[PDB]
């Protein structure tokens, strides 16, 4: 596809697809959980559910409109969807919710029922969803005392002390035209969207959001949440990685694809060309693992997550996995690098060429907000095809060899050994 950006006072981006049967229109702001403090942690999660509340959604469903929203660390989104010949109504609804009249939504009755609904989501998350809350605690110890540590949903202790005035203060400082991108995906022409905006003289708020004092800093650390009543052990482990607008962005993504993802109960996942699986399958040390490479405006993370029921062989799983990471600096084969090139292109093709216009609106707005434009998928494939074996060794010797780590765990983790027995496995030194 082909993107098209403009600036008439308002930044308008679009990605037309004539094959789609729908159209999405929305606005993406360049502020998220990393632009908050510990006192108001969760105020962006309440704006999501106030936008999706029942009396607001009822007004939309009478004209054939569906609503969505998403809160992350670096951005926030508010999307409206419609049939292709009804995109003029999508913009009017968005006009009387952000540019005008966001006081009818913050009434007393609408704010108390919404608050009670959010306190029950975050409570069930902390007691039932173990893989995702251990990955949240990883961000909280790795980036402690910096903005990138705060959870995106909020906490139960900070949510209870939020009143209406906290919602209005956060909007005056962040929902600004200088911090906003208007997006359009699916079956919508680029020129029909901009002329519709020019015929209304819209302006959210002018600009100059706050300054954000501290930068993100990685600290080697651990946090353990032991619970012997649960039936598994959930563990995550990472080093410091690459931010966006880094030269090593795609080299870190390719090195995670070398070790990849595993499911013990799927037969075809046991046959992948991954050397680590010859050690794990002898005694069945885990149920699943997945390797990630996450990237933000200021820093990143590189590592893996696992879940297991073999609570007596945890130390052999962590040991064998970290000995394969060492091979990226010493001994990594040309065959392993060509496999990972092909599967990474398939992974990026499914993410960017899905059918949903709502997913494409979130990717487009976040990219334009953070580098001014969007890289094509044909240009990204050429960068991936130009990575050599020497490039992987240079990246790993800087980022992996003899470097500090962050750890988080929950469940039956008595068998997870101390920090320094694990820190020592990051360098071979039988060498």
């Amino acid at each position: 596809a082909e993107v098209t950006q403009l600036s008439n006072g308002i930044v308008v981006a679009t990605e037309h697809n004539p094959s789609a049967h729908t159209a999405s229109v929305g606005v993406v702001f360049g502020s998220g959980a990393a632009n908050e403090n510990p006192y108001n942690n969760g105020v962006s999660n309440l704006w999501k559910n106030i936008f999706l509340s029942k009396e607001n959604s009822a007004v939309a469903a009478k004209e054939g409109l569906a609503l969505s929203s998403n809160i992350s660390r670096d951005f926030q989104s508010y999307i409206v969807s419609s049939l292709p010949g009804s995109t003029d109504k999508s913009l009017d609804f968005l006009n009387q919710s952000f540019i005008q009249q966001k006081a009818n939504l913050l009434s007393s009755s609408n704010f108390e029922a919404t608050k009670k609904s959010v306190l029950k989501q975050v409570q069930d998350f902390e007691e039932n969803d173990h893989p995702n809350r251990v990955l949240e605690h990883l961000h909280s110890t790795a980036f402690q005392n910096t903005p990138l540590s705060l959870p995106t949903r909020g906490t139960l202790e900070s949510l209870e002390n939020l009143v209406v005035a906290d919602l209005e203060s956060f909007a005056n400082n962040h929902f600004l035209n200088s911090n906003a991108v208007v997006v359009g995906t699916g079956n919508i022409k680029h020129e029909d969207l901009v002329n519709s905006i020019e015929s209304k003289n819209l302006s959210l708020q002018t600009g100059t959001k706050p300054v954000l004092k501290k930068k993100a800093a990685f600290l080697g650390s651990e946090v353990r949440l032991r619970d012997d009543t649960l039936p598994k052990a959930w563990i995550s482990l990472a080093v410091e990685g690459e931010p966006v607008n880094s030269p090593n962005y795609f080299v870190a993504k390719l090195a995670a694809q070398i070790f990849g993802s595993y499911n013990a109960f799927e037969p075809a996942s046991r046959l992948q060309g991954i050397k680590l699986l010859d050690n794990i399958q002898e005694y069945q040390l885990c149920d699943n693992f997945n390797h990630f490479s996450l990237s933000y405006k200021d820093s990143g993370l590189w590592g893996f997550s696992t879940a297991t029921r073999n609570v007596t062989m945890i130390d052999d799983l962590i040991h064998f996995t970290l000995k394969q990471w060492n091979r990226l600096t010493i001994s990594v084969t040309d065959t392993e690098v060509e496999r990972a090139k092909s599967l990474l292109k398939l992974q990026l093709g499914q993410l960017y060429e899905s059918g949903n216009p709502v997913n494409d609106a979130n990717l487009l707005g976040a990219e334009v907000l953070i580098k001014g434009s969007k890289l094509s998928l044909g240009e990204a494939f050429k960068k991936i095809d130009a990575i050599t074996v020497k490039d992987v060794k240079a990246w790993a010797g800087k980022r992996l060899w003899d470097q500090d780590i962050a750890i988080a765990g929950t469940g039956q983790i008595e068998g997870l050994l101390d920090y320094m027995r694990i820190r020592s496995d990051m360098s071979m030194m039988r060498w």
Partner: protein
Amino acid sequence: MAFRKSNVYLSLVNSYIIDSPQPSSINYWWNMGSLLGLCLVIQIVTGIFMAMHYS
């Protein structure tokens, strides 16, 4: 598993001086028993080298 846990002879070394679980609060009075093992090695070695010249 690791070779130090599967081999018949290294498994004993691992279970005793590498992976043995210890209380975290023991103090320096718990170090006298390792010294007594060094004392016995000193005496047996020095005495054997003198016994080559003794009558």
